[PDB]
């Protein structure tokens, strides 16, 4: 039987008749304490026969569900989180009654580490991936840029090479905000690690659908960052339609996302003996200059240090 | 006016949303409106712009914390040596001594933490974990006195870093646990703090933290990870623990850490397109100092000779404007309620905002009252720099654990 931490009927560990066998074990805060938390009586309740049980090591039914208390008041308590886990295995637990535990304390915390991780053990220990992809894109329904939620589902991707659906839901999640940085870093991982980018129709592809990302947002530095990423590997001077194809924005689309594009292409195009040299250093210094006074102030010091570092180099 | 902030220009600098709302858009259109309205009261209440740090204030908020806190802390119980850590360094930062009976309580409440296996827990009695024994050790050295340096069991400590190496040449934040580049921090913080770096201890760390790097030029949690400041941060000063700074791309880093600091708002996000916060004031903008030393140990000869490479000013005013709370401590936000790592962290990146310095030159910027200037603090230990030699010295007293 469950009796829920937040039931109207919970009653204290210290008043339940199953429990007055067990001393609870007080913190040793020491004789002069520090950053000692004046813990609510619950709390102190719950924790003081965790203590006792853990103390012990008593491997019970009773400790499994007292764990479960300990958890929903501090779900960051990793003793708690490692004690539950050696009672899972010790009282043989059903894991599938012990993943939809977990998936209800995550919907309800789904920014703590330790429930994530609890998941990623159910599902090794299980070596069942078949919940995960569906549950995860419920947590990025409710949050799309949850950390913890993207580094479950590269490892759940990674670890059972379910990679076949994964760009169509990065396409989905880009529909729904383009600007969403985890979903373009998404991107790069599924292709990285199918294709690669070194497949020119993919890098084309890659490019284009970008560009057109830009297009309609210009001023959206998760396209404009996700285009110099994947070009920048070989180098962006290697790509001479490009710094045309860009200053063909400069009157409709311009940002200092467009501008700073712009030096990084003359940066390269320096580093690799271009032709009119002191002609593309002029226009590099000029929008450094331009960055650094006007279009992008906040980066006044990168941008003075950039002009200062082409002068030494390409002077 | 004088400060970059309220200059008429600076409404310029708000989000271009090219007419195509989604999510972030609206979230930072929202946050936008929110510190407009701070930047804009003293012109809405006819009154001279005063930027105070409220020293007695923080300092109250921080010397009740360090003995006492309400159960709104019972999140934090496994978690008590990282609030040691926060609060003794922002009273480090605020020039407050620490009472030697206070140092004596901090000494001894850290022993009941620290596991007889080796590392800290985040209380007495929990397991070893690598962020509280990072926390631990960095709260000892601030104390800095022989009891507190003897409070730390070296040769468990390293047994209980190599219980954590993993042959991929990643560690694992506590047995059971996983793995993320803090973890490489914290083990490399504490080794070399404590001269446990014995010459096999860090073999493929180098070679991990740089496999985090991804296409945006950050750092993320585990490779294939969204490059996020807490993680740069951490991957970047492991490195340069390591004199392995070089493993990395230290331009595309330079770039994207840049990128990070907000043209509006003045302070720095976690990540492209997330909101601004003010914690990240030390995980984004310590990454300069780090960079800065990084690129003159390779002899560049273009880096600036009194400022970092951010906006050092916008970042003052972001936290100073921001980030206080009228009670005392400091915030993520306008709107957010303070907490002892905010207080911690906001300080801490007003401190490396103020204080410049490469080899022989020394320059400070410090924005409102000359009472704002804070204590410097160590841009890879994020403890004073006088702890950090102190620690480093005595410590080097000590052979390192044989085995
Ligand atoms: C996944 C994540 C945040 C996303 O969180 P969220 O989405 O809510 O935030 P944002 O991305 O801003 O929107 C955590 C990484 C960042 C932390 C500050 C790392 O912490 C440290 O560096 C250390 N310690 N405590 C130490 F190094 F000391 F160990
Ligand atoms: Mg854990
Ligand atoms: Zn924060």
Request: aromatic share 12%.
């Given at each position: 039987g469950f009796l829920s931490l937040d039931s109207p009927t919970y009653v204290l560990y210290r008043d339940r008749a199953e429990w007055a066998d067990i001393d609870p074990v007080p913190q040793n805060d020491g004789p002069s304490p520090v950053v000692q938390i004046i813990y609510s009586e619950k709390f102190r309740d719950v924790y003081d026969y965790f203590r006792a049980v853990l103390q012990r090591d008593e491997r019970s039914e009773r400790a499994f569900k007292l764990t479960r208390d300990a958890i929903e008041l501090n779900a960051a308590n990793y003793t708690v989180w490692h004690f539950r886990r050696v009672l899972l295995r010790s009282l043989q637990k059903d894991l599938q009654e012990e993943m939809n535990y977990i998936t209800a304390i995550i919907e309800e915390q789904p920014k703590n580490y330790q429930v994530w991780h609890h998941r990623r053990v159910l599902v090794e220990w299980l070596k069942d991936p078949s919940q995960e992809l569906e549950f995860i894109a419920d947590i990025l329904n409710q949050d799309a840029k949850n950390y913890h939620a993207w580094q479950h589902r590269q490892w759940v991707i990674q670890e059972f090479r379910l990679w076949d659906n994964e760009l169509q839901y990065v396409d989905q999640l880009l529909k729904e905000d383009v600007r969403n940085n985890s979903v373009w870093n998404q991107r790069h991982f599924v292709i990285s690690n199918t294709t690669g980018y070194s497949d020119r129709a993919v890098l084309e592809r890659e490019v284009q659908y970008t560009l057109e990302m830009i297009k309609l947002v210009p001023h959206n530095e998760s396209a404009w960052n996700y285009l110099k990423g994947i070009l920048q590997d070989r180098g962006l001077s290697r790509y001479p339609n490009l710094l045309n194809q860009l200053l063909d924005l400069q009157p409709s689309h311009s940002s200092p996302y467009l501008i700073a594009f712009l030096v990084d292409i003359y940066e390269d195009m320096l580093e690799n003996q271009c032709d009119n040299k002191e002609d593309i250093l002029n226009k590099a210094l000029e929008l450094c200059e331009i960055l650094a006074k006007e279009k992008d102030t906040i980066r006044k010091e990168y941008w003075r240090y950039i002009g200062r570092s082409l002068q030494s180099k390409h002077s | 006016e004088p400060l970059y902030s309220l200059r008429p220009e600076h409404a310029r600098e708000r989000l271009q949303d090219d007419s195509v709302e989604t999510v972030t858009s609206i979230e930072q259109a929202k946050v936008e409106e929110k510190i407009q309205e701070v930047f804009s009261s003293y012109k809405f209440n006819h009154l001279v712009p005063r930027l105070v740090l409220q020293r007695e204030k923080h300092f109250h908020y921080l010397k009740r914390g360090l003995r006492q806190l309400t159960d709104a802390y019972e999140c934090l119980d496994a978690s008590r040596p990282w609030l040691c850590y926060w609060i003794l360094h922002s009273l480090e930062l605020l020039d407050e001594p620490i009472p030697q009976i206070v140092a004596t309580d901090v000494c001894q409440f850290l022993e009941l933490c620290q596991s007889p296996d080796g590392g800290f827990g985040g209380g007495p009695g929990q397991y070893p974990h690598l962020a509280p024994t990072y926390a631990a050790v960095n709260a000892l050295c601030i104390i800095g006195t022989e009891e507190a340096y003897n409070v730390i069991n070296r040769e468990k400590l390293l047994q209980y870093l190599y219980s954590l190496k993993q042959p991929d040449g990643s560690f694992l934040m506590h047995v059971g646990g996983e793995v993320d580049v803090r973890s490489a921090y914290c083990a490399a913080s504490v080794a070399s703090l404590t001269n446990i770096?014995?010459?096999?201890?860090?073999?493929?760390t180098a070679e991990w933290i740089a496999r985090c790097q991804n296409w945006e030029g950050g750092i993320g949690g585990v490779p294939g990870m969204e490059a996020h400041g807490g993680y740069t941060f951490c991957g970047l000063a492991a490195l340069v623990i390591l004199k392995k700074e070089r493993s990395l791309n230290l331009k595309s880093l330079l770039q994207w850490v840049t990128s990070r600091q907000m043209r509006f708002e003045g302070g720095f996000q976690g990540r492209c397109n997330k909101l601004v916060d003010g914690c990240y004031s030390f995980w984004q903008a310590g990454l300069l100092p780090l960079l800065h030393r990084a690129l003159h140990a390779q002899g560049d000869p273009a880096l600036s000779m009194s400022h970092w490479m951010f906006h050092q000013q916008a970042l003052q005013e972001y936290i100073l404007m921001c980030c206080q709370c009228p009670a005392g401590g400091l915030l993520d936000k306008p709107g957010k309620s303070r907490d002892f790592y905010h207080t911690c962290y906001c300080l801490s990146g007003l401190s490396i905002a103020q204080h410049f310095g490469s080899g022989a030159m020394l320059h400070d910027v410090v924005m409102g009252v000359p009472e704002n200037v804070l204590q410097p603090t160590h841009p890879v230990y994020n403890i004073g720099p006088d702890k950090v030699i102190q620690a480093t010295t005595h410590f080097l007293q000590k052979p390192v654990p044989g085995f």
């Open positions: - | 770096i014995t010459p096999d201890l860090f073999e493929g």
